[PDB]
Amino acid sequence: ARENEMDENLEQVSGIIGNLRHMALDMGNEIDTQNRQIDRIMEKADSNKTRIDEANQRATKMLG
Amino acid sequence: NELEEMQRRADQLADESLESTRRMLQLVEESKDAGIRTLVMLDEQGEQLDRVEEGMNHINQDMKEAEKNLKDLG
Amino acid sequence: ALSEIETRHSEIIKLENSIRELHDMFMDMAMLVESQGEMIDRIEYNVEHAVDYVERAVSDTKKAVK
Amino acid sequence: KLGKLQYSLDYDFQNNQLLVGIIQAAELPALDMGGTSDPYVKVFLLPDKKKKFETKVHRKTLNPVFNEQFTFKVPYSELGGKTLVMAVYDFDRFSKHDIIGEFKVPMNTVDFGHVTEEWRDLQSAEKEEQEKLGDICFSLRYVPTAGKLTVVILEAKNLKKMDVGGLSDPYVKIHLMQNGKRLKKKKTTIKKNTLNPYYNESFSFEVPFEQIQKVQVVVTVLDYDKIGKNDAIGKVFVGYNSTGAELRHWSDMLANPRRPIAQWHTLQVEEEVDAMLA
Amino acid sequence: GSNRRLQQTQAQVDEVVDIMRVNVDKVLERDQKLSELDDRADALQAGASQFETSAAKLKRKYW
Ligand SMILES: [Ca+2]
Ligand SMILES: [Ca+2]
Ligand SMILES: [Ca+2]
Ligand SMILES: [Ca+2]
Ligand SMILES: [Ca+2]
Ligand SMILES: [Ca+2]
Ligand SMILES: [Ca+2]
Ligand SMILES: [Ca+2]
Ligand SMILES: [Ca+2]
């Protein structure tokens, strides 16, 4: 029967789609955590930029 | 009349639907592979982001020490 | 009826098109994540060089008040 | 020695049936007792799993004459997807009936409009390695300075049926083995009722880079049974005494530091794996 | 049923379509944040190199 092969294909497709749902969910969670992590890294980047710029400013001023 | 053409139209459309389901299977399999590779890449980039954040921390500590030394020179 | 089999065929093709949109969406996902991986590699390079330069400057400033 | 087989083939379009002719086989090896063999021919269609036909038994003849005809109830539209298989077997009273030689004709090359009849030299039948057990994909990441080994159990597919009347209840247990002693036993969650389980579960171990070439990682896929000991589906091992794709993945993990490598692996039977584990 | 398998599979498919769309947009935002962090990283290592030069000057001067 060809309808049987069709329905079997439908079932396999359904299960694989569910697996893709789990993958999409875990993917999304990891993406969110990495976005927060990027925010922290950028905050530290601005702080270290401030410290380096100020230290180089005073260091250049102390020339003499 | 068009009776034979009607039956062959039913079998033909059924064939197109079946091959459509085959295309579905191939597409969801490729999507599956690309998704897995995407997850692994996200793991690599994630650990890299962790070591980058720890690097920023070490830069912050060292630069704080250099700030202290500059305040000692001042 | 040809109406029944034809409507079933139409719904099947609709499911195929939805799975095509999801498919291209997954491929776009992998591509964007790849390019982001390259940019992350470059960021890691710049951060490492910043670690080296910061370490040198800290060493010198520590050795200057000695 | 490659023998010959004389076969007929014709299609009945009125009743939509396949007429297969077994005429005679020629130049048969002197198997069975000394001098002469005992041949019987089993005929069956390749895609279908229908009941296989077998000819009469001919006692002590190297050139047997069957002159038998079989009918296969097959639609002509589906016959494009089928292939005819004719296998010449040998008869043994007290031993396993060894197959002498088989051959197959793809139905897409047969012109059933004109009556077909051909001589075909037999070929030695191909053999399967083992029943399909399954594959499992996971990634390996190693950083020497910290000694952390991240094994991310990704997924598996095409797992063998275990519970009777059902598909499977798979879960993954990884054993860190060394010197024939089990050291760390980690396991994943149970994904109930599936043949393509998905995990995406990260695990970690302590592996110094001074012992990296003396540790074994045993990835074991098992099936959960609600009552009784959970039977094991399959298992693979990477590290020392690893062969082929396993040593390939381990070498990729070593050549790629601070980076994960995702890879598939073909499960082997628990007995032969435990045998390969010295 | 036969139509119910199609309806279930279709519902799951459209669901993963929505989820994956949200994820793809999240990866767009991630791409912006990674470009910004890239610029900040390059400028940061440049300024760190300059501070290394000035630190070398002050070391060779006051020591
Ligand atoms: Ca594939
Ligand atoms: Ca992380
Ligand atoms: Ca962190
Ligand atoms: Ca024999
Ligand atoms: Ca005998
Ligand atoms: Ca079982
Ligand atoms: Ca079970
Ligand atoms: Ca944003
Ligand atoms: Ca932003």
Residue numbers in the entry:
A (entry chain D): 141 to 204
B (entry chain C): 9 to 82
C (entry chain B): 191 to 256
D (entry chain E): 141 to 418
E (entry chain A): 27 to 89
Which statements did the authors publish about this structure?
We subsequently successfully applied our methods to the previously unknown crystal structure of the complex between synaptotagmin-1 (Syt1) and the neuronal SNARE complex, which mediates the fusion of synaptic vesicles with the synaptic membrane and is essential for Ca2+-dependent neurotransmitter release.
We reprocessed the XFEL diffraction data of the Syt1–SNARE complex at 3.5 Å resolution to take advantage of all improvements implemented since the original publication. The XFEL data were collected at the X-ray Pump Probe (XPP) endstation of the Linac Coherent Light Source (LCLS) at the SLAC National Accelerator Laboratory, using a goniometer-based fixed target sample delivery station and an automatic sample loading system similar to the setup used for conventional synchrotron data collection at SSRL (Cohen et al., 2002, 2014). Of the 362 'long unit cell' diffraction images, 328 images were successfully integrated using the wide grid search parameters, while 34 images could not be integrated for a variety of reasons (insufficient number of Bragg reflections, poor diffraction quality, or un-resolvable multiple lattices). Even though only 313 XFEL diffraction images were used in the final merged data set, it had high completeness (97.8%) and good multiplicity (6.1), along with reasonable merging statistics to 3.5 Å resolution. Moreover, the reprocessed XFEL diffraction data produced slightly more interpretable electron density maps, which in a few cases allowed better modeling of side chain rotamers that were previously difficult to interpret. Additionally, more Ca2+ were visible in the XFEL-data derived maps (21 Ca2+) than in synchrotron-data derived maps (15 Ca2+).
